[PDB]
């Protein structure tokens, strides 16, 4: 899938990846918080409308009910900490590839290639995904917009300049 969003208020804070999302199989959970983001795959029990309740203090993980039989955990630098942010997630032969690159805008015309940032193996079936909305808690109202595009096996002819 292709994820794009021009929300310049730090609302998008990760993406959920899974196939059934009922704690039956493993599911990838990404939390793109302020600093030292955490990427852990486990058997999460996702809610109908998952979200982060920032109370400052971080969220108390209201997205999943319980998760104990986990297999992998990854922690690294934050991801892309009016600006437009684009994301591309692929799962080929068990390896999960992440492409992202921030380009300031005034989806305008032109070309802006994305850079590979994180490539980690998961080895799990990913069929459905859902974004995460960040809000403060008497819940604080807010709005956000993002773009979603489905990828397909294609063939492109890339042109490289002198740089």
């Amino acid at each position: 899938v292709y994820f794009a969003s021009t929300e310049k208020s730090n609302i998008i804070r990760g993406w959920i990846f899974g196939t059934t999302l009922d704690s039956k199989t493993q599911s990838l959970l990404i939390v793109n918080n302020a600093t030292n983001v955490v990427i852990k795959v486990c058997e999460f029990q996702f809610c109908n409308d998952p979200f982060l309740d920032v109370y400052w203090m971080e969220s108390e993980f209201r997205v999943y009910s319980s998760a104990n039989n986990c297999t992998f955990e990854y922690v690294s630098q934050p991801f892309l900490m009016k600006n437009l942010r684009e994301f591309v997630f692929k799962n080929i032969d068990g390896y999960f590839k992440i492409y992202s690159k921030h380009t300031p805008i005034n989806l305008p015309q032109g070309f802006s290639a994305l850079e590979p940032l994180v490539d980690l193996p998961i080895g799990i079936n990913i069929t459905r995904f859902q974004t995460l909305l960040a809000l403060h808690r008497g819940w604080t109202a807010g709005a956000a917009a993002y773009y979603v595009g489905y990828l397909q096996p294609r063939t492109f002819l890339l042109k490289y300049n002198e740089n």
Binding site: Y2, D49, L114, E115, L133, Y147
Partner: peptide, 25 residues
Amino acid sequence: QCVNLITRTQSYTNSFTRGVYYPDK
């Protein structure tokens, strides 16, 4: 907890030339 609070609508937008990335490093 698990409360249904966030709502979402749908709309369409034309992506002219977006989605390009480096296939190899």
